[PDB]
Amino acid sequence: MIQGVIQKIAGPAVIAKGMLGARMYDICKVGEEGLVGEIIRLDGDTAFVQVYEDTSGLKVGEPVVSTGLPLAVELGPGMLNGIYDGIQRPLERIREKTGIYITRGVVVHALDREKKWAWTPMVKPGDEVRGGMVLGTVPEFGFTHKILVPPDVRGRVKEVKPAGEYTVEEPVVVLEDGTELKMYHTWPVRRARPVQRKLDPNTPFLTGMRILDVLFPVAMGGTAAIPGPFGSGKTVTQQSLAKWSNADVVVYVGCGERGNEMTDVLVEFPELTDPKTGGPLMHRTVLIANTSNMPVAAREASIYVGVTIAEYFRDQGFSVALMADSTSRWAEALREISSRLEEMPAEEGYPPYLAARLAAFYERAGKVITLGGEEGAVTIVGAVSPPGGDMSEPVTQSTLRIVGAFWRLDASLAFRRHFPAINWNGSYSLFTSALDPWYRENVAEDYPELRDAISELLQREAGLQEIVQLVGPDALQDAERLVIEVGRIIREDFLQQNAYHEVDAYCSMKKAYGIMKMILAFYKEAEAAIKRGVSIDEILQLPVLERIGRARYVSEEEFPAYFEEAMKEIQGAFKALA
C-alpha cells in the first residue's frame, strides 16, 4: 500500500507527505514503532493522520505505511469467552507477552492463530453460493459455530477441504474465480450488516426482575433505556441482566469505566454459572472493557464493535442481548473527539451530530430474517447517567426519542433503600399489547387482567397521597385504609427485590403471577370483611400477612406447595372472623 514519510509533528496530529493514493478514514501505521492512526484529511500529496497513542520521541522523516482499510473487526470462531478493548485487542494475550502494563505499539491478533478447530463441511463442489449462507459448522463450547460466506461474496464452489483439524487461516472453500474463503472475515464497524426483512417482535425478553418483566416489559428485539442519578442502581441492574437473562449470547460493553468498578465485573464473572446449562457463565459472554486511560479513539468506537459482534451472532440464528453501560461517558469521548476537530459545538457543548450517532447505534436492533433464511434478534439496553440527575440533558432527550422502553430510576427511593428504585409513575413501555397474546398461552389466560388490576390498585394509592399528607393514616376511613395498606403490601412484597440474596435475585413468571393472585385474593377477602363490617385493625393483625411477606424468599421448586397452602389459608383465616 502507499508509503510515505513524516513531514510535521504537532502532538497527536502528524502530517505525512508522499501519501498520494491513500483513502479517507484508513488505518495507518505511524513511525518505526508502528503506532496506529486514522487519515482525516487529504490535501495534494500530503495526508493528515491522528495518532491514537503518545507521540513523544518521534522524529521527522520516519516512514508512514497505510493499511488501506478502515476500522474493522475480525468475525469468526474464538470470540466467546474473550476479553477485548474498544478496538478488539485480546487483553489476556497482551499480558502474557508484556506484563502488567500496556506498552505502546504492541501487536496482537483478535482471533487466535494457533488453535485447531474441528471442521465439518456442508457444501459440495459444483454448488452455487451467495452471501450469508452456511459453508460448515465448528463446535465451540455448547454451541455449533456456523461458518458463513461473507455477505458481498457470491460464486460457484470449486474445491472443498475435507473434515479434519484446521486453524482459522486455512482456506476451507475456494471459489471458481480464485477467491479463497476462510473461517473468518473482516467487516467495518460503521457499516450495518444487511439482512432480508425486519419483523415485529412478539416474544418477551425475560429479565428475572419482577417489576421489569411484569409492569414495563420489553420485547425480544426492542430497545430500552435506564437513566438515573448516582447510586440509583444502574450497574447492579445491568449485571443482573447479564447474569439472569434468557438470551443465547450476551455482549457486555463498558465505556470509560472506573478501574476498580471494571475490576469488580472482571473478577466476579468467572466465578458464576450459566442458568440454562449449569456451565460457566463466561462461556456465553463477550466482554469489552475500557477504563478511562485507554485513548479516546478506542473508547468512542467501543459501542460499534460490540453492536457489530452482536449483529454477527444474530446472523447465525441466535438471540443476542447487548448492554452498554454508561453511554453518557461515550458521549464525553465523542465530545472530546469533536473538540479536537474544532467542530462548532451545539447546546451543552455536544456536537450537532450526536443524535445521528445515537440513532445509528440504537436502530441496529430488531428481529430479522437473516440472509441464510434463519431468524435472529438483537436486544439493546442502554444506561444513561445524567450530570445533575435532570432528564433535560441532550443525551437523555436524544435517547428518549427512539427507545421503546424507559426504566427511569429515582433518587428518593434510593435514599429509603427501596431497590430497584424504579419510578413506576414515570416509566412506560410500548410492548405490552404486542406481548399480550404471548402471555395468555404460556403463563395464564387471565394474566393481563391481573396486571391491569395491580396497576389500578397502585394508581388508586397515588391519588390518596394528598390525604395522608394532611391527616394521619389512622384517621382515614376503613375503605381508604384498605387500599393504603394493600399498596404498602404491594410495594414491599412485589416491587421490592434484593439482587444480592441467594434466591430473591431471580424470579420467574409463574411465581410473580402467584404472588399477584394471592395479593388480589387478600384484597377481595378484606373488602368483603369490610362490607360485613369489622375493624381494620383486626385485619392488619392477621398472621397470613406474614405468608405473603415471606413469599419472596421461598425457593423456586418449593413455591407451588407454598402457593397452594396460602391460597386456602387466606380463605380459612377470613372465614374465621366476624
Partner: protein, 315 residues
C-alpha cells in the same frame, strides 16, 4: 447521452471536496461521485469560482482518494418525476419505491424547490375540511388552503392523531349546494426521522382501513442519510402541488415531525460554517421554513387546493 467527468480533486476534508477545473459546473448543480471501488455517492455544488468548485457530499467521505475519484454532472436543477399512478405507492423520501412494486413511468419532471406564488394570482380560502374531531371541526375548523400546525409533546400521542386525521379526512359537497358530484380528495403523508416501530404502525394503520388507495407515502427513517430528511418534504409538496394544480385534486399534506427536520438542518449547516442563531440553529432557518409552509393555498381560476398540517413536539 454523453457524460463529462472531472478528475481534478485537490482537497478532501469533512463533508467538502474541491474540484479544480470545473468551470462549467453551474451553481447549485447536482453531481455524483464515483470512487475506485465503483460505489457512487451524491453531492451538490455550494460554491463555484475560477480556481476551484466546492462540492459537499450527501453522505460520509469514507473510501475517497485523490487519484481514482471522479466527479460527473447529473442535472443542473434537482428534479422529480411525477405521475397520477403514484397514488397507493410508498417511497423513501428521495424517489425510490420501497413497496417492492416496479417503478413508475414519469409524465413530467418538476423542480423540487418550486417557485413563489404571485400574491395577485392567489384567492382567499373559503371552504372547510371535516376531520372527524369535534374540538377541531367546531372550534378551530380547518379551511382549504390553510396551514395549521399541531403542537405536541414527548409523551403525547401525536402519531395516533396524525393517523386518525389521515384516515377520517373528507370534503362534504352536500353542505355547499354546488352539487353532490365527486371532488377528488388525496392525502400526502411525509414522515421523517421515524423509527422502525412507528414505520410498521403507520403502514399497518394505512393498510387496514383501506386509505392507502388514495394516498402517497414518503417515509424517511432515522438511520437514513441526513440529506434525505432535508429533501423529504419538498418532494411531497411538489407532488401535492402537481396533483392539485394540474388535476383539480383537493390534497392534504401532513408533516410528521419538523423537529427532526430542524435537527437535520442544524447538522447540515455546519458545513457552511456561519455564525449560529438563537440555540445553535442556523440564522436562516426562518427562510428555510418559509420556503416549505408558504407552498400551500388556493389559486384564482383553478379548482384544486393544498392544505398542510405540520406536527412538531415542543422541546
Amino acid at each position: 447521452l454523453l457524460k463529462k467527468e472531472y478528475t481534478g480533486i485537490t482537497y478532501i476534508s469533512g463533508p467538502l471536496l474541491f474540484v479544480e477545473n470545473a468551470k462549467d459546473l453551474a451553481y447549485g448543480a447536482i453531481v455524483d461521485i464515483k470512487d475506485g471501488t465503483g460505489r457512487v455517492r451524491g453531492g451538490q455544488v455550494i460554491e463555484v469560482s475560477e480556481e476551484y468548485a466546492v462540492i459537499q457530499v450527501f453522505e460520509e467521505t469514507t473510501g475517497l482518494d485523490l487519484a481514482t475519484t471522479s466527479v460527473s454532472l447529473v442535472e443542473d436543477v434537482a428534479r422529480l418525476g411525477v405521475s397520477k399512478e403514484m397514488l397507493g405507492r410508498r417511497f423513501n423520501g428521495i424517489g425510490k419505491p420501497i413497496d417492492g412494486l416496479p417503478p413508475i413511468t414519469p409524465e413530467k419532471r418538476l423542480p423540487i424547490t418550486g417557485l413563489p406564488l404571485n400574491p395577485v394570482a392567489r384567492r382567499k380560502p373559503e371552504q372547510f375540511i371535516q376531520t372527524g374531531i369535534s374540538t377541531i371541526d367546531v372550534m378551530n375548523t380547518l379551511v382549504r388552503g390553510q396551514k395549521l400546525p399541531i403542537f405536541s409533546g414527548s409523551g403525547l400521542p401525536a402519531n395516533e392523531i396524525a393517523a386518525q386525521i389521515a384516515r377520517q379526512a373528507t370534503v362534504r359537497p352536500d353542505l355547499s349546494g354546488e352539487g353532490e358530484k365527486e371532488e377528488p380528495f388525496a392525502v400526502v403523508f411525509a414522515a421523517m426521522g421515524i423509527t422502525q416501530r412507528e414505520l410498521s404502525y403507520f403502514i399497518q394503520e394505512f393498510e387496514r382501513t383501506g386509505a392507502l388507495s388514495r394516498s402517497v407515502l414518503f417515509l424517511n427513517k432515522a438511520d437514513d442519510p441526513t440529506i434525505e430528511r432535508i429533501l423529504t418534504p419538498r418532494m411531497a409538496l411538489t407532488v401535492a402541488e402537481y396533483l392539485a394544480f394540474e388535476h383539480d385534486y383537493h390534497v392534504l399534506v401532513i408533516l410528521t415531525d419538523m423537529t427532526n427536520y430542524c435537527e437535520a438542518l442544524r447538522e447540515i449547516g455546519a458545513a457552511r460554517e456561519e455564525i449560529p442563531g438563537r440555540r445553535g440553529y442556523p440564522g436562516y432557518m426562518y427562510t428555510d421554513l418559509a420556503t416549505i409552509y408558504e407552498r400551500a393555498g388556493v389559486v384564482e381560476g383553478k379548482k384544486g387546493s393544498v392544505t398542510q398540517i405540520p406536527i412538531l413536539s415542543m422541546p
